[PDB]
Write a protein that binds this ligand. Sequence first.
Ligand code: FTD
Ligand code: CA
Ligand code: CA
Ligand code: CA
Length: 341
Amino acid sequence: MIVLFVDFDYFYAQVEEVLNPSLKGKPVVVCVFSGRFEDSGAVATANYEARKFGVKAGIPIVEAKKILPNAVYLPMRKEVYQQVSSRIMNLLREYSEKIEIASIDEAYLDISDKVRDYREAYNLGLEIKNKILEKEKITVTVGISKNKVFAKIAADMAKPNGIKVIDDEEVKRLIRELDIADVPGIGNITAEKLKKLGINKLVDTLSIEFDKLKGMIGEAKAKYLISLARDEYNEPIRTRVRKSIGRIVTMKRNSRNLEEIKPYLFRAIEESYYKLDKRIPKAIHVVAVTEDLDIVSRGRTFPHGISKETAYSESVKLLQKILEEDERKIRRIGVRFSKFI
DNA sequence: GGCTACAGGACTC
DNA sequence: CAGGAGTCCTGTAGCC
Ligand SMILES: NC1=C(F)CN([C@@H]2CS[C@H](COP(=O)(O)OP(=O)(O)O)O2)C(=O)N1
Ligand SMILES: [Ca+2]
Ligand SMILES: [Ca+2]
Ligand SMILES: [Ca+2]
């Protein structure tokens, strides 16, 4: 199989630049302002000029400003980046009907039937990059390999504005040398346990006792790493269909007062319903982020669709459940809808 | 034993 | 000082 993975560079910031070319060359930081106070909130992303200096996704807006006080700080305009993203995905569909849109800025293309080898795959890579640059003036990174995992690792290595092919031999080389932290799906918590059992590389997972790996990181993750280490990983590229839609908001003040949480819960329901579009959920979860940033939730599935009105009343019952089963205060409240008709 | 629902864990962008 | 959205897996308990 040949997989070509496309990853939009510094997407949100790059779209802001395309819309305001005066930003070009400057550090740009796209932020999610929470409302709690001047500059409360976090960074969604930043362009390379800002990232060079340590301004990256997830840090507090306040910390970024200590580092880069004169950078351009912009509020997130996701609906704008979604429309640009949709247009680029349409361009990629021209190059393969087997396409997996993984997120607003990543897509996998199975081009097994379009090219014979990596040479033609690379050339198809340039063709796509040039097409996108020409139509939308967005630069992207193309990673090419035998499966989704290594096509992505490839783009991780080549970004920004790059294109890289990892052939069969480098797969083998990476299985030996690639740090197992850099493997998609392995985060600090897992990485600590792997580079706890001396597992620093995919290969190490083959020599260790299975029940032992599974004991630490669970069955699915151990099979996954092991299949990758055996160079036997295959996950088909398939149409991703949205499984859930929701919204969660930050309250101006922490609370556990039902009447004071309601307005937030209700606005979260309103936005969610809008985004549901013509989808009818049968399940609803109320999600609370507590004062210490722990995530709590209670949900219900129905044997029929949930009307907005039923969403409102059930959401309050589920929120009561949370309130009466946990003595902490809430900081963020929301809902998530799923199991669509 | 293993399927189902539900709640939490971890991860990704 | 810690936003938001969305996915997959797992432990526990009910049930066949
Ligand atoms: N924590 C966090 C992220 F890591 C990423 N992020 C959004 C989701 S999509 C957009 C992609 O930005 P990027 O292209 O700057 O990310 P990169 O692909 O370089 O890792 O970033 C976001 O909103 N929050
Ligand atoms: Ca990405
Ligand atoms: Ca990207
Ligand atoms: Ca990692």
